[PDB]
Structure formats: structure tokens, C-alpha cells
Amino acid sequence: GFLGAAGSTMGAASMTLTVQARNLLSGIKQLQARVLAVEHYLRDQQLLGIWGCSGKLICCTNVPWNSSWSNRNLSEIWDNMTWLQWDKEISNYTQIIYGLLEESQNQQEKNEQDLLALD
Amino acid sequence: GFLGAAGSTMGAASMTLTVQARNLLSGIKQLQARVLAVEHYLRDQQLLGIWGCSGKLICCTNVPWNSSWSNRNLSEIWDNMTWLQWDKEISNYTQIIYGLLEESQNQQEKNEQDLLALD
Amino acid sequence: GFLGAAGSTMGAASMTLTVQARNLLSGIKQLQARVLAVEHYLRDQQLLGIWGCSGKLICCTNVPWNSSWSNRNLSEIWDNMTWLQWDKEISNYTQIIYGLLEESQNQQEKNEQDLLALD
Amino acid sequence: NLWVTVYYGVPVWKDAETTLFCASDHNVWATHACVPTDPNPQEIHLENVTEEFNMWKNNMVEQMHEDIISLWDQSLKPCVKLTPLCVTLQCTNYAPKLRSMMRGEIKNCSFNMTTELRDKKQKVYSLFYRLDVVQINNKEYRLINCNTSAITQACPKVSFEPIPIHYCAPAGFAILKCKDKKFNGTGPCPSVSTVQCTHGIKPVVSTQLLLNGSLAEEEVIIRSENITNNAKNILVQLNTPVQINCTRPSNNTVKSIRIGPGQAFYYFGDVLGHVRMAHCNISKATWNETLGKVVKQLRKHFGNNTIIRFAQSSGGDLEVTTHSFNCGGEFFYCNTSGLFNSTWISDSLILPCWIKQIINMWQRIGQAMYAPPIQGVIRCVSNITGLILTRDSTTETFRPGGGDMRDNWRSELYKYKVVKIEPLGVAPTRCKRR
Amino acid sequence: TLQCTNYAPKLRSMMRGEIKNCSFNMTTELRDKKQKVYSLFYRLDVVQ
Amino acid sequence: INKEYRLINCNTSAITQACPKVSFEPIPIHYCAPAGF
Numbered sequence: 001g002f003l004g005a006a007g008s009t010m011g012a013a014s015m016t017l018t019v020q021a022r023n024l025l026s027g028i029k030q031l032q033a034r035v036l037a038v039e040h041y042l043r044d045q046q047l048l049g050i051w052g053c054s055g056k057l058i059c060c061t062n063v064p065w066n067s068s069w070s071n072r073n074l075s076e077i078w079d080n081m082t083w084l085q086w087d088k089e090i091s092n093y094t095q096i097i098y099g100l101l102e103e104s105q106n107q108q109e110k111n112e113q114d115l116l117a118l119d
Numbered sequence: 120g121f122l123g124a125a126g127s128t129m130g131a132a133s134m135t136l137t138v139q140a141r142n143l144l145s146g147i148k149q150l151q152a153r154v155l156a157v158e159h160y161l162r163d164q165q166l167l168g169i170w171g172c173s174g175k176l177i178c179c180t181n182v183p184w185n186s187s188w189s190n191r192n193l194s195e196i197w198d199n200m201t202w203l204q205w206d207k208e209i210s211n212y213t214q215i216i217y218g219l220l221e222e223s224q225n226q227q228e229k230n231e232q233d234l235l236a237l238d
Numbered sequence: 239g240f241l242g243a244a245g246s247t248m249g250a251a252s253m254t255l256t257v258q259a260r261n262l263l264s265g266i267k268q269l270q271a272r273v274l275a276v277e278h279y280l281r282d283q284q285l286l287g288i289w290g291c292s293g294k295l296i297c298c299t300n301v302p303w304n305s306s307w308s309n310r311n312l313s314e315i316w317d318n319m320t321w322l323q324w325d326k327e328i329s330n331y332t333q334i335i336y337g338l339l340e341e342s343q344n345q346q347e348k349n350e351q352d353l354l355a356l357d
Numbered sequence: 358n359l360w361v362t363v364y365y366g367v368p369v370w371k372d373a374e375t376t377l378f379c380a381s382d383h384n385v386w387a388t389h390a391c392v393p394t395d396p397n398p399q400e401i402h403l404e405n406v407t408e409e410f411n412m413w414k415n416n417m418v419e420q421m422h423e424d425i426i427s428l429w430d431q432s433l434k435p436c437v438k439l440t441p442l443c444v445t446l447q448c449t450n451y452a453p454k455l456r457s458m459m460r461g462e463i464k465n466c467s468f469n470m471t472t473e474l475r476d477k478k479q480k481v482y483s484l485f486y487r488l489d490v491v492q493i494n495n496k497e498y499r500l501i502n503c504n505t506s507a508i509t510q511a512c513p514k515v516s517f518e519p520i521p522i523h524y525c526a527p528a529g530f531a532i533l534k535c536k537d538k539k540f541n542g543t544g545p546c547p548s549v550s551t552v553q554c555t556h557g558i559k560p561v562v563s564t565q566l567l568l569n570g571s572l573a574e575e576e577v578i579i580r581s582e583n584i585t586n587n588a589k590n591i592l593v594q595l596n597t598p599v600q601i602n603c604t605r606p607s608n609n610t611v612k613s614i615r616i617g618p619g620q621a622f623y624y625f626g627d628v629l630g631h632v633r634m635a636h637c638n639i640s641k642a643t644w645n646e647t648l649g650k651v652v653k654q655l656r657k658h659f660g661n662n663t664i665i666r667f668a669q670s671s672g673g674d675l676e677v678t679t680h681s682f683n684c685g686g687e688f689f690y691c692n693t694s695g696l697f698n699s700t701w702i703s704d705s706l707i708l709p710c711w712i713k714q715i716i717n718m719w720q721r722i723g724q725a726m727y728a729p730p731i732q733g734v735i736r737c738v739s740n741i742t743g744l745i746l747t748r749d750s751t752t753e754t755f756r757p758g759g760g761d762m763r764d765n766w767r768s769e770l771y772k773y774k775v776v777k778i779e780p781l782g783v784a785p786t787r788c789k790r791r
Numbered sequence: 792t793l794q795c796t797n798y799a800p801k802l803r804s805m806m807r808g809e810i811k812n813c814s815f816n817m818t819t820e821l822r823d824k825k826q827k828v829y830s831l832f833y834r835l836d837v838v839q
Numbered sequence: 840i841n842k843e844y845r846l847i848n849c850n851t852s853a854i855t856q857a858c859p860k861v862s863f864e865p866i867p868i869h870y871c872a873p874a875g876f
């Protein structure tokens with residue numbers, strides 16, 4: 001169900017992303033609400049685009065983990081914490097992570113162009 | 120031309136998908152109509168996304184054909200049927216196929232993540 | 239900055255595509271303006287999709303340059319000309335390139351489907 | 358050994374009911390929220406495609422009347438409201454010695470009328486038709502609108518000439534055109550073509566006879582929801598036009614006055630020539646041929662041994678019992694008694710016409726409009742391209758019927774259907790993903 | 792301008808003055824004719 | 840009117856009284872582009 005995994009651990013919750021994603025699209029003020037929802041959806045799709053993640057729900061990238069953002073171990077993060085707790089844990093670093101992802105994808109695309117140029 | 124292949128066989132009609140794709144996008148009720156057209160377009164694009172087909176008109180998956188949905192051979196389906204007749208013959212199965220496609224993409228994404236995890 | 243590289247050479251300006259991509263998504267007439275902006279964005283994304291570029295910002299294709307569109311050498315184009323001048327220079331050829339890109343992608347997708355069909 | 362392949366852009370569609378756009382290349386029908394039409398409209402014939410059409414369930418008729426009524430009201434609202442005209446009238450006969458059919462039709466009525474200054478009143482005299490002014494008890498009369506509704510004065514600068522209006526599909530939807538001669542408005546159509554937008558449809562308002570409509574080239578087409586159900590109307594599309602010349606021969610004077618700050622009332626003045634009754638000239642030979650074609654089609658539907666009779670409307674209001682039409686802002690009502698007077702067992706007809714200055718369009722009660730007068734003598738020429746018939750056991754008697762504009766609009770929209778595109782689909786192929 | 796009297800001059804049901812019987816000139820369908828009309832009002836709606 | 844006088848607007852239109860609670864002092868207005876422009 002929608003948000004059914006919200007209280008589950010991050011690992012278990014990672015298996016329910018499809019239902020939550022599919023329910024994101026589902027006088028003047030309601031039309032404004034529909035337009036705003038579309039704009040937010042497209043903002044998320046464009047953010048995935050500039051990172052090279054537009055084609056999938058789970059997209060691995062080439063940006064390493066800083067460890068200053070959070071020093072919890074992998075097992076702790078995925079098996080003990082919930083996604084709300086994780087969001088709080090790194091709420092101060094989102095604008096840095098997104099910028100690094102943007103730079104990484106830009107370098108990846110330029111590298112692909114240079115590799116394709118080889119005869 | 121737009122829908123020119125509607126009466127053509129499925130095989131020949133598969134070569135005209137570009138025209139319909141471009142023709143899906145081309146006073147309060149006029150704005151409402153445009154918003155609804157956008158919502159339907161985005162629902163279809165998200166549905167292709169969850170299937171891993173966001174960038175293609177034709178994409179293959181790993182989901183097998185049940186054969187109970189339709190026991191016609193490929194020659195009969197592609198040469199002796201129109202898309203309208205095919206759509207009618209599987210009208211009771213479409214949502215089952217959609218569910219299987221979503222599960223297949225979820226398994227592919229998790230398997231891809233695990234393969235990428237190997238050094 | 240938005241359009242900060244607009245006066246830069248095409249080569250230098252190619253490194254700021256993500257600034258434009260991010261910024262382009264930043265009483266009834268105002269809602270109409272927002273909906274039209276969304277429709278233009280979606281038409282551009284659909285146009286990239288039909289070409290098979292998915293979410294890539296720099297998309298390399300299989301369509302050769304004819305040289306009748308512009309006979310400048312690569313170095314002159316990228317180092318001694320801006321995007322405004324270049325876009326004006328080839329304004330009469332844009333729809334031909336777009337048609338060639340759509341045909342090339344349709345052939346590529348059919349070839350990929352046939353390759354996948356091989357056991 | 359088969360796998361699912363997903364196709365996007367598949368030429369499949371479903372029946373749909375959605376909002377259509379206005380397209381059109383002062384007039385009451387002019388629409389600001391309307392786009393110029395395509396200079397080169399596209400039509401794509403669908404080869405080997407047969408599809409069921411149903412005019413009776415077509416959802417574009419509802420949009421047609423909703424758009425026409427809303428546009429009408431929006432155009433009429435920003436005009437002078439005649440609140441001080443619902444007053445007691447003291448009337449006499451305009452021309453007491455006439456022996457023509459206009460005897461008693463026009464009355465000369467006096468009333469005290471408010472002026473721009475609240476302190477001052479001005480007696481006014483004007484002429485009205487006998488159908489707008491009704492006796493209370495010279496004689497005293499009142500305007501009929503005072504019985505049910507207030508009057509808005511239509512702006513004299515606004516023209517009522519029908520402008521063809523195109524209805525265009527929204528993106529993601531398409532309009533299919535049957536384009537099949539002798540199609541009876543229902544069932545399979547093998548000649549279906551896809552159009553992005555329809556041709557222009559004029560908002561022509563009439564009853565009993567269908568004016569300025571499409572002609573059925575192959576033969577007269579008889580359309581009904583149920584051809585043996587006498588509660589439904591029969592819509593007849595002719596294969597030949599019938600030219601009709603209607604006129605208001607009197608040379609009428611027009612006067613205007615100011616009734617309040619920025620408000621003015623326009624009214625009928627004296628007559629500048631001999632008083633003559635409005636009438637319509639219909640060729641008898643052309644009508645005779647039209648009757649022959651209608652009768653043979655009715656025999657085909659009801660049996661070749663049936664006697665057919667045409668008769669005048671048995672009852673209802675003037676909008677139902679008589680033919681009505683608009684010419685240049687003037688609203689004419691004509692008896693038609695000489696058109697539906699015949700029994701079939703197997704050179705020029707003049708119809709009297711009456712003028713009503715105050716009308717109630719589209720069967721709406723509680724709203725009314727006062728048309729402005731028009732100067733001089735008005736003549737108009739139009740084509741009759743269809744008929745409305747209603748059926749009453751040896752002899753089947755038919756009458757004009759009518760009275761519902763949605764049938765008049767359906768008689769034009771019967772050829773078009775709205776569908777939604779379903780660009781996604783699946784099919785088995787011998788193809789696996791990596 | 793409203794002219795009122797007591798609808799029920801004698802009663803001890805605590806309504807002795809709650810309902811007034813009022814008359815007024817009013818207007819009519821035609822602006823030239825006025826019609827005097829009588830109706831009842833509650834004391835909470837009508838004030839002297 | 841032709842002492843007896845009338846308001847200058849009487850022969851043009853009805854005149855609306857502006858609400859006295861609404862100030863008429865100009866406020867600088869900034870025009871902003873919609874997204875995409």
C-alpha cells in the first residue's frame with residue numbers, strides 16, 4: 001500500500017518504491033493543485049535526468065560517500081533506521097550531494113563523448 | 120500519417136509509432152483539457168519508466184508469454200490481425216501483464232545493483 | 239549563472255547545460271502560462287525521447303553531418319562562434335536534422351529488437 | 358518461447374467524452390477564447406477500418422448547446438438591462454383601418470418612462486407587435502416578459518449572423534468522421550477517416566425545418582433513435598437544397614432614446630410605407646420533388662403499401678407549432694401550413710409570417726431578450742437542407758414536431774465521433790531483454 | 792417604512808410580543824402599481 | 840441643465856464611488872518571467 005513501508009526499515013522499504021512512485025500522478029484552485037503536482041513531479045524527473053538516473057527507480061552513481069554527512073555504518077543505516085530518520089540525519093547535506101551528483105554526471109557524459117570519438 | 124496504420128497489420132503498423140508519439144502532445148475547461156492530456160501522457164511515461172522502457176518506443180522484457188492470454192501464433196497475430204482486434208482479445212489481461220512487468224523490472228533493478236556491487 | 243555562458247564560445251558554453259536545464263523549471267493567465275511552459279518542456283523531452291537520447295544532455299547519434307548545412311570546420315565552429323550565431327546559421331536545416339534523427343532511431347530500435355531476438 | 362514486447366504509440370483508441378476546443382478563422386458568435394483554424398486541415402482515410410457510430414449518444418451535442426448558450430449569455434450580459442420598461446402600457450391600434458392580415462398586429466402603446474435624472478420622467482409612445490404585448494384586463498396592456506422575467510437589451514452593435522464554428526480535439530484525442538453516404542446515424546461505418554478538427558458548424562437556430570445544413574449527396578437519409586417509437590423525432594437529411602426567400606417587406610422606422618446614465622433603449626417607430634406582412638416564398642415544384650423523395654424513403658422504412666399524410670402541428674407554443682428563424686437580427690415565425698398539407702396514396706407558395714420582438718430562446722423560462730429593431734425592409738435567402746418529422750394504422754400521419762435545438766445540432770454532428778488514443782499496448786514477440 | 796401591531800394581543804405563552812403583524816407598501820411586477828401587503832415578522836427582525 | 844445643474848457624468852454612464860479605504864499611492868511592481876522565458 002501507499003506509504004505502507006514508511007515505518008519499515010530502509011532495506012525493506014526499498015522494495016516498495018513502485019507503489020509510492022505510481023501514486024504520485026494519481027474550480028481554479030484544484031486546477032492549480034494539479035499543475036503544481038505536475039511541476040513537482042517534473043522537477044524530480046529532471047533532477048534524475050541531470051544525474052543520469054531518469055530510466056530507473058534505483059540508480060547507483062559514481063559519487064563516493066563523504067562520511068562527514070553521516071558516520072553510521074551500512075548495517076545500521078539500512079537495518080535499524082527508517083527513511084524518515086535518515087532524511088533527518090542528512091537534511092543539512094542535500095544541497096551538497098545534489099551538486100556533486102550533477103558534476104559527476106557532467107564529467108561522465110563528457111568522458112562518454114571522448115570515448116565515442118575514438119575510431 | 121496519424122493513425123494511418125490503424126487498419127494495417129500489426130507488423131506494418133509497428134513502424135508508424137513515431138507519428139502517434141508526436142501526436143500525443145501536439146477558457147477554464149480548455150486549460151483543464153490540456154492538464155488532463157498532460158496527466159495522461161505523464162501516466163504513460165511513468166508506466167514505461169517502471170518497466171524500464173522510458174527511452175524506447177519498442178522494448179523487450181524478461182516476462183514470458185502465458186499462452187493462455189492468446190494461443191495464436193506470431194504469424195497470425197502480426198499478419199492477420201489489426202491492433203484494435205488484438206487490444207480487444209487481451210482486454211481482460213492487460214493489468215496482469217502490467218503487474219508482471221513491474222515485478223520483472225524490480226527484480227532486474229535489484230539484480231543489477233547486486234552485480235554492480237561486485238568488485 | 240543562467241545564460242552566463244550565452245556569450246561564451248560554443249565549446250565553453252557546452253559545460254553549463256545543467257544550469258539551463260535546472261532553471262527552465264523554476265489570475266487564470268498565470269496558470270495558463272505555467273501549463274504552456276510545462277507543455278513546451280514535455281514536447282522537448284518527447285523530442286529527445288523519440289531520438290533515443292533518454293535523459294542525456296549531450297546526445298551523440300548515428301546521423302552523419304551532410305556539410306551542406308554548414309561547411310565550417312569543427313575548430314572554427316566551436317572556438318570562434320557563439321551558440322546564437324550558430325543557431326541562426328542553420329535555422330533553415332533544423333527540421334531536416336530532426337527528421338533524420340527520428341528515422342535513424344527507428345532503424346536502430348528495429349535492429350536492436352532483431353539482435354535481441356537471436357538465441 | 359514468446360515474451361512480452363511493449364509498444365508505445367499503438368494506433369488503438371477507446372470511446373471518450375472530453376472537452377473540445379473552439380477554432381474559427383461585432384458578432385454575437387465571435388469568441389475570444391478561440392484559435393484561428395488550420396489553413397490546410399488534415400484528413401487521413403483509414404483503410405479497412407469499420408467502426409460503430411451512434412449520433413444519438415454523441416457527446417458533442419451536449420458541448421454544442423452548452424457552448425452556444427454560454428457564449429450567448431456572455432455576449433448579452435454586457436448590455437443595457439431594460440428594468441424601467443416593465444411598466445403599464447396604454448395602447449390603441451396603429452392603423453385601425455387596415456383590412457390586410459396585419460390588422461391588429463401592431464399596437465401603439467404609451468407609457469411614462471424614467472429619465473437620466475431621477476427627478477424627471479418622460480412619456481414615450483412606441484409600436485409593438487401583438488405577440489409581445491398582452492392585455493391586462495383605449496386598452497391597457499403589459500409586456501409579456503413581466504409575466505416571467507426581466508429583459509436585457511441586446512447591444513445593437515452585435516450581429517447575429519451564424520459563423521461556422523470548428524470543434525477541435527484536445528491533444529491525445531481524435532475525431533473520426535464516418536464519411537459514408539447513406540449512413541443512417543447508427544451502427545458500423547466502413548469509411549471512417551481521422552480528423553484533428555471538424556469543419557465549421559454554423560449556430561443556425563430554427564425549428565421544424567433544418568436550414569443551411571449538410572446535404573446527403575446519395576439520397577435522402579431518414580434518421581431516428583427508434584423508427585417505430587412515436588415519442589422520438591425523425592431527422593430527414595435532404596439530397597437537394599430547397600431555396601427559401603423570407604422577408605419583412607415593411608419599411609420600418611427606428612428610434613432611440615436615453616433611459617439612464619449611459620443606458621439607451623431602441624424601439625420601433627412609425628412605418629414609412631404601406632404596411633405589409635412578413636412572408637416566405639418557397640418554390641412549389643422543388644418542394645413537390647422534396648416531398649416525393651421523403652415519401653419514398655418513408656415508404657421504404659414503414660412499408661410500400663402505407664398511405665402517408667402530412668399535417669400541421671397539433672399543438673404547443675409558437676416555437677413548436679410554427680417554423681422560426683433569424684434573419685439579420687430579426688426573428689421570424691412562419692405558419693408552414695402549405696408545406697405539410699398532403700396525402701400520398703399508392704407555382705410558388707407564400708407562407709404568412711409574424712414577428713416577435715421579445716423571445717425566449719432554447720426553451721429557457723425565467724430569461725428573456727429584447728432584440729433591437731432593424732431599419733427599413735429586410736430580405737434573406739437560405740437553403741432548407743433537412744426536415745423534422747414526428748409520427749402519430751393504415752395511414753401514418755406526420756407533423757413537423759421539433760422544438761429541441763439539440764436535435765438540430767445532432768443533425769450536423771451525426772458524422773463525427775470523439776475517441777481517446779491508447780498509445781500503449783503489448784504483444785508477444787520472440788525477443789528477450791539482456 | 793413598516794407599520795406594525797401585535798399579532799396576538801392576548802396570550803401568556805411567553806410569545807406576547809414575539810410575533811408582529813406588519814404592513815408595507817412594497818412594489819409590484821409593474822413599476823407604476825404598488826401593492827399594500829400584510830405579513831408577520833418576529834420581534835428580532837423588526838426594530839422600531 | 841438649462842440654478843439647476845446636473846453631474847457631468849449623467850449623460851455618459853453611471854458613476855461608481857471608489858472605496859475610500861483603498862489607497863491610490865503607486866507601489867513599484869516587478870515583472871517576472873515565467874519559467875522557460
Ligand SMILES: *[C@@H]1O[C@H](CO)[C@@H](O[C@@H]2O[C@H](CO)[C@@H](O[C@@H]3O[C@H](CO)[C@@H](O)[C@H](O[C@H]4O[C@H](CO)[C@@H](O)[C@H](O)[C@@H]4O)[C@@H]3O)[C@H](O)[C@H]2NC(C)=O)[C@H](O)[C@H]1NC(C)=O
Nearest residue numbers: 516517518519561568569682683684685686737738739740
Ligand atoms: C444561410 O446562409 C445564407 C448565406 O449567407 C444566409 O443569408 C445571408 O444572411 C446574412 C444575414 O442577414 C446577410 O448579411 C446581411 O445582408 C444584408 C443585405 O441587405 C446587409 O444589409 C447586412 O448588413 C447590414 O446589417 C449589418 C448588421 O446585421 C450591419 O453591420 C451592416 O452595416 C448593414 O447595415 C448583412 O450584410 C447575407 O447577405 C445573406 N446572404 C446573401 C447571399 O444575401 C442565411 O441567413 C442563412 N440562414 C440563416 C437561417 O441564417
Ligand SMILES: *[C@@H]1O[C@H](CO)[C@@H](O[C@@H]2O[C@H](CO)[C@@H](O)[C@H](O)[C@H]2NC(C)=O)[C@H](O)[C@H]1NC(C)=O
Nearest residue numbers: 449451465466467480482483484625626627628
Ligand atoms: C401613437 O399615438 C400618439 C397619440 O395619438 C401619436 O402622437 C400624436 O399623433 C398625432 C397625429 O397622428 C399628432 O397630431 C399628435 O400631436 C401626437 N401627439 C403626441 C403626444 O405624440 C403617435 O404618433 C402614435 N405613434 C405612431 C407611431 O404613429
Ligand SMILES: *[C@@H]1O[C@H](CO)[C@@H](O[C@@H]2O[C@H](CO)[C@@H](O)[C@H](O)[C@H]2NC(C)=O)[C@H](O)[C@H]1NC(C)=O
Nearest residue numbers: 602603604606636637638639705706707736737
Ligand atoms: C413572393 O412572391 C410574391 C408573388 O408571388 C411577390 O409579390 C410581388 O412583389 C412585387 C415586389 O415589388 C410586387 O411588385 C408584386 O405586385 C407582388 N405581387 C404579388 C402577387 O404579391 C413577393 O414579392 C415575393 N417575395 C419574395 C421575398 O420573393
Ligand SMILES: *[C@@H]1O[C@H](CO)[C@@H](O)[C@H](O)[C@H]1NC(C)=O
Nearest residue numbers: 004005006007008009012013
Ligand atoms: C515494526 O516493528 C516490529 C518489530 O519486530 C516489526 O515486526 C514490524 O514489521 C515493524 N513494522 C513495519 C511496518 O515494518
Ligand SMILES: *[C@@H]1O[C@H](CO)[C@@H](O)[C@H](O)[C@H]1NC(C)=O
Nearest residue numbers: 063064065066067068069096
Ligand atoms: C568530507 O567532508 C568534508 C567537509 O568539509 C571535506 O573537507 C572532506 O574532504 C570530505 N571527505 C571526502 C572523502 O569526501
Ligand SMILES: *[C@@H]1O[C@H](CO)[C@@H](O)[C@H](O)[C@H]1NC(C)=O
Nearest residue numbers: 071072073074075076077080
Ligand atoms: C553499526 O552500528 C550499530 C548501531 O548500534 C552497532 O550496533 C553495530 O555494532 C555497528 N557495526 C559496526 C560493524 O560498526
Ligand SMILES: *[C@@H]1O[C@H](CO)[C@@H](O)[C@H](O)[C@H]1NC(C)=O
Nearest residue numbers: 069087088089090091092093
Ligand atoms: C543542521 O544544522 C543546524 C545548525 O545550522 C544544527 O542545529 C542541526 O543539528 C543540523 N542537523 C543535522 C542533521 O546535521
Ligand SMILES: *[C@@H]1O[C@H](CO)[C@@H](O)[C@H](O)[C@H]1NC(C)=O
Nearest residue numbers: 123124125126127128404405
Ligand atoms: C486492405 O485490404 C486489401 C484487400 O485486398 C489489402 O490489399 C490492403 O493492403 C489492405 N490495407 C490495409 C491498410 O489493411
Ligand SMILES: *[C@@H]1O[C@H](CO)[C@@H](O)[C@H](O)[C@H]1NC(C)=O
Nearest residue numbers: 182183184185186187188189
Ligand atoms: C497460463 O495461465 C494460466 C491461467 O490460470 C495459469 O494457470 C498458468 O500457470 C499460466 N502459465 C504460464 C506459463 O504463465
Ligand SMILES: *[C@@H]1O[C@H](CO)[C@@H](O)[C@H](O)[C@H]1NC(C)=O
Nearest residue numbers: 190191192193194195196199
Ligand atoms: C497459426 O494458427 C492458425 C490457426 O490458429 C493456423 O491456421 C496457421 O497455419 C498457424 N500458422 C503458423 C505459422 O503456425
Ligand SMILES: *[C@@H]1O[C@H](CO)[C@@H](O)[C@H](O)[C@H]1NC(C)=O
Nearest residue numbers: 188206207208209210211212
Ligand atoms: C472478458 O470477460 C468478459 C466477462 O463477461 C467476457 O464477456 C469477455 O469475452 C472476456 N474477454 C476475453 C478476451 O477474455
Ligand SMILES: *[C@@H]1O[C@H](CO)[C@@H](O)[C@H](O)[C@H]1NC(C)=O
Nearest residue numbers: 242243244245246247250320
Ligand atoms: C569576450 O571577449 C573577450 C575578448 O578577448 C575575451 O577575453 C572574453 O573571455 C570573452 N568572454 C566571453 C564570455 O566570451
Ligand SMILES: *[C@@H]1O[C@H](CO)[C@@H](O)[C@H](O)[C@H]1NC(C)=O
Nearest residue numbers: 302303304305306307334338
Ligand atoms: C546533402 O545535401 C544535398 C543538397 O541537395 C542533398 O542532395 C543530399 O541528399 C544531402 N544528404 C544528406 C545525407 O542529407
Ligand SMILES: *[C@@H]1O[C@H](CO)[C@@H](O)[C@H](O)[C@H]1NC(C)=O
Nearest residue numbers: 309310311312313314315318
Ligand atoms: C577553418 O576554415 C577557415 C576558413 O578560412 C580557415 O581559415 C581555418 O584555418 C580552418 N581551420 C581548420 C582547423 O581547418
Ligand SMILES: *[C@@H]1O[C@H](CO)[C@@H](O)[C@H](O)[C@H]1NC(C)=O
Nearest residue numbers: 307308326327328329330331
Ligand atoms: C534561410 O531562409 C531565409 C529566407 O527564408 C534566407 O534569407 C536565409 O539566407 C536562409 N539561410 C540559410 C542558411 O539557408
Ligand SMILES: *[C@@H]1O[C@H](CO)[C@@H](O)[C@H](O)[C@H]1NC(C)=O
Nearest residue numbers: 445446447466467468469480
Ligand atoms: C403617465 O402619468 C400620468 C400621471 O398623471 C398619467 O395621467 C398618465 O396616464 C400616465 N401615462 C400612461 C400612458 O399611463
